[PDB]
From a paper:
Stimulated by the evidence for two Rab binding sites in some bMERB domains (Mical-1, Mical-3 and EHBP1L1), we searched for crystallization conditions of these RBDs with Rabs in a 1:2 stoichiometry. Crystallization conditions were found using a complex of Rab101–175 and the RBD of Mical-1 (residues 918–1067), yielding crystals that diffracted to a resolution of 2.8 Angstrom at a synchrotron X-ray source and the resulting structure indeed showed two molecules of Rab10 bound to Mical-1. Whereas one Rab protein binds to α-helix 1 and the first half of α-helix 2 (Mical-1918-991, binding site 1, blue), the second molecule of Rab10 binds the second half of α-helix 2 and α-helix 3 (Mical-1994-1060, binding site 2, green). Upon superimposition of both binding sites, the strong similarity becomes obvious and the helices from both binding sites adopt very similar positions. Upon closer inspection and alignment, a strong similarity between the two Rab binding sites in Mical-1 became obvious, involving the same/similar residues both within the two different molecules of Rab10 as well as the two binding sites in Mical-1, respectively. Consistent with the localization of the two separate binding sites within the N-terminal and the C-terminal half of the bMERB domain, respectively, deletion constructs lacking either α-helix 1 (Mical960–1067) or α-helix 3 (Mical-1918–1020) displayed a clear 1:1 stoichiometry of Rab binding both in aSEC and ITC experiments. Furthermore, the ITC data allowed us to clearly allocate the high affinity binding to the C-terminal binding site and the lower affinity binding to the N-terminal binding site. In summary, the strong conservation of interacting residues between both sites as well as the structural conservation of the binding sites lead us to conclude that this family of Rab binding proteins must have evolved via gene duplication. The work presented constitutes the first description of two Rab proteins binding a single effector domain.
Rab proteins, the biggest subfamily within the superfamily of small GTPases, are major regulators of vesicular trafficking in eukaryotic cells. One such family of effector proteins that was reported to link Rab proteins and the cytoskeleton is the Mical (molecules interacting with CasL) family. In this publication, we present a thorough biochemical and structural analysis of a Rab effector domain termed bivalent Mical/EHBP Rab binding (bMERB) domain. The results show that the domains probably constitute a Rab8-effector family involved in endosomal trafficking, and the Rab-binding specificity can be well explained from the 3-dimensional structures of complexes determined in this work.
Residue numbers in the entry:
A (entry chain B): 918 to 1014, 1026 to 1060
B (entry chain A): 5 to 175
C (entry chain C): 6 to 146, 150 to 175
C-alpha cells in the first residue's frame, strides 16, 4: 500500500494547485472590475471603448478562461484518481470469487472501465470543438 | 468540486436583457440600472443534475453589432447558446434569424440552441405573442421559454434544461 | 494535446500483454502473474512528429470465460498488436481464431502488428525470429518487457502506421 500514499501526493499537489487557481482568478476578477470602470469614464466614443477593451480587458478575460480550463482538467484527473481505486477494490473482490452475484460485481468493474473511458472520450470531443 | 465543465453563451440584440437574465441566475437579483455590455465576459455557477455536478461557464456577449465580429469569435467552444429576444420589442424577435445564422457560421454544428423571450412580466407591452416564439422554436426543433429576469420567471429552469440537454449527449 | 489514438492488445493468458503494456506505460517489469479480468486500458502521451499524440492502449484478458464481452471493444480499435512470446507454446494454435475475431468484429481499416516478447528468454526460445516473421511478411505488417528492449519503438511504430493513414 505504498502506492496508496503516492495517490495522496498526487491528490495534494492537485488540491494546492486548485487553491492557487481560485486565488489567481479572484485577483483577475478584481483587476477586471477596476479596469472596466476606468474604461467607462475614459472615453465617450463607443468604438473607442471597443478598441480600449481589446487593449486590456480582453487579455485578462482569456487569462481567466485558461485558468478555468486548467481547473476542469484537474477535476477530471481527480475523477480518474478515484475511479481507479474503485477498479482496484472490485478487482480484489472478483479475485476472491451465489452464482448470480459475481456476474453483478464483474459488470460493476466493467462499467467503471467505461466511466474512465467516457471521461477520455469527453475531453476528446471538447478538443475537437475548440479546434474547428 | 464538480465533474464536468459546460460552456454556455448568451446572444441577442442590445437591450433584451441578457446581462440581467444571467444576473438573476447567478446572484438571484435584478437591477433596473442599465449598463450595456462591452465585449464579452463570463460568470460561473455550479449545478447538480441527477448526481452529476456540472460547472456552467456562461459568457455574456455584447448585443450591439459593432462587437459582432469579436463576440462571434467565441462561438467555437460553446456547448449551449441562448438566443434572447424581448417580447415588448418586435425588432429583437425579427432578428432571431440573423442570430441563428451567426450560430450556423461560427458555432459548432453540434451545439444546442435554446430560445428565450425575456420580459414576460410586462404583458401590456407585448408585441410578440408567446405562440410565435413557440412557432419558430418548433420549426427549428429547439426549446423555447418565456422568461423574466425581474419576476424570476423561468430563468433557472431554462438554464438547467439547457444543461440537462447538453449533459444527456455527453458520453 | 494534438490527437488521440486507441490501440488494443489481444492474446492468450500467459504471453505478456499486461507486462508489455506495463513496460511501456511505466518502464518497469514484475515477475508475478496477475491475470487481467475483463478489460483495462492505460493512457500514454507521446511527442511524435511534433504532434502530441495521446495513446489509449486497451489491454484484453485472454481467458476463455471473457471471450464474449471483450469482443465489444474491437470496433473502436484503430491500431492493434497481437501478443507473441518466443518461449510460449501453442499460443499460435489460436492465432487464426483471434484473427477470425478481428475480421469478424473490428473496423475494416484497423491496423495489425505482431510482437515477439520476452526475447531475453533465449534459452527457452522455442520459436525463431522468422518462424513467425515469415507470417508477418505473409500479411505485410522482438521485445522484452523484462529487459525493456524495443518496447518503446514498437509502440511508436504503430503510431507511424496510424498517423500515416491520417493524411
Ligand atoms: N421589465 C423587465 N425589464 C427587464 C427585464 N430584463 C431586463 N430588463 C431591463 O431591460 C434592460 C436590459 O438590460 P441588459 O440585461 O443589459 O440587456 P442586454 O441584452 O444585456 N444589453 P447589452 O447586450 O447592450 O449588454 C435593463 O435596463 C433591465 O433593467 C425583464 O425581464 N423585465
Ligand atoms: N522473462 C520474461 N517474462 C515475462 C515478460 N513479460 C511477461 N513475462 C511473464 O509472463 C507472464 C505473462 O504476463 P501477462 O502479461 O500477465 O499475461 P497476459 O497475457 O496479460 N495474461 P491475461 O490475458 O490473463 O491478462 C507473467 O508471469 C510475466 O511475469 C518478459 O518480457 N520477459
Ligand atoms: Mg449585456
Ligand atoms: Mg493481463
Amino acid at each position: 500500500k505504498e502506492e496508496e500514499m503516492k495517490r495522496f501526493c498526487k491528490a495534494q499537489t492537485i488540491q494546492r494547485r486548485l487553491n492557487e487557481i481560485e486565488a489567481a482568478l479572484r485577483e483577475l476578477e478584481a483587476e477586471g472590475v477596476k479596469l472596466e470602470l476606468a474604461l467607462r469614464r475614459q472615453s465617450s466614443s463607443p468604438e473607442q471603448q471597443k478598441k480600449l477593451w481589446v487593449g486590456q480587458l480582453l487579455q485578462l478575460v482569456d487569462k481567466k478562461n485558461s485558468l478555468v480550463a486548467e481547473e476542469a482538467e484537474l477535476m477530471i484527473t481527480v475523477q480518474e484518481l478515484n475511479l481507479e481505486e474503485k477498479q482496484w477494490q472490485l478487482d480484489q473482490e472478483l479475485r476472491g470469487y451465489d452464482r448470480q452475484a459475481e456476474d453483478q460485481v464483474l459488470r460493476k468493474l466493467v462499467d467503471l472501465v467505461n466511466q474512465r473511458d467516457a471521461l477520455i472520450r469527453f475531453q476528446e470531443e471538447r478538443r475537437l470543438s475548440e479546434l474547428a | 468540486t464538480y465533474d464536468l465543465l459546460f460552456k454556455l453563451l448568451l446572444i441577442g440584440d442590445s437591450g433584451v436583457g441578457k446581462t440581467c437574465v444571467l444576473f438573476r441566475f447567478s446572484d438571484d437579483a435584478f437591477n433596473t440600472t442599465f449598463i450595456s455590455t462591452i465585449g464579452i465576459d463570463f460568470k460561473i455557477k455550479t449545478v447538480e443534475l441527477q448526481g452529476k455536478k456540472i460547472k456552467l461557464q456562461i459568457w455574456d456577449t455584447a448585443g450591439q453589432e459593432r462587437f459582432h465580429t469579436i463576440t462571434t469569435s467565441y462561438y467555437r467552444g460553446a456547448m449551449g447558446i441562448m438566443l434572447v429576444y424581448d417580447i415588448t420589442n418586435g425588432k429583437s424577435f425579427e432578428n432571431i434569424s440573423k442570430w441563428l445564422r451567426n450560430i450556423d457560421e461560427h458555432a459548432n454544428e453540434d451545439v444546442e440552441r435554446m430560445l428565450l423571450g425575456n420580459k414576460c412580466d410586462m404583458d401590456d407591452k407585448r408585441v410578440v405573442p408567446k405562440g410565435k416564439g413557440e412557432q419558430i422554436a418548433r420549426e427549428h426543433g429547439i426549446r423555447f421559454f418565456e422568461t423574466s429576469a425581474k419576476a424570476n420567471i423561468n430563468i433557472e429552469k431554462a438554464f438547467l434544461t439547457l444543461a440537462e440537454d447538453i449533459l444527456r449527449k455527453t458520453p
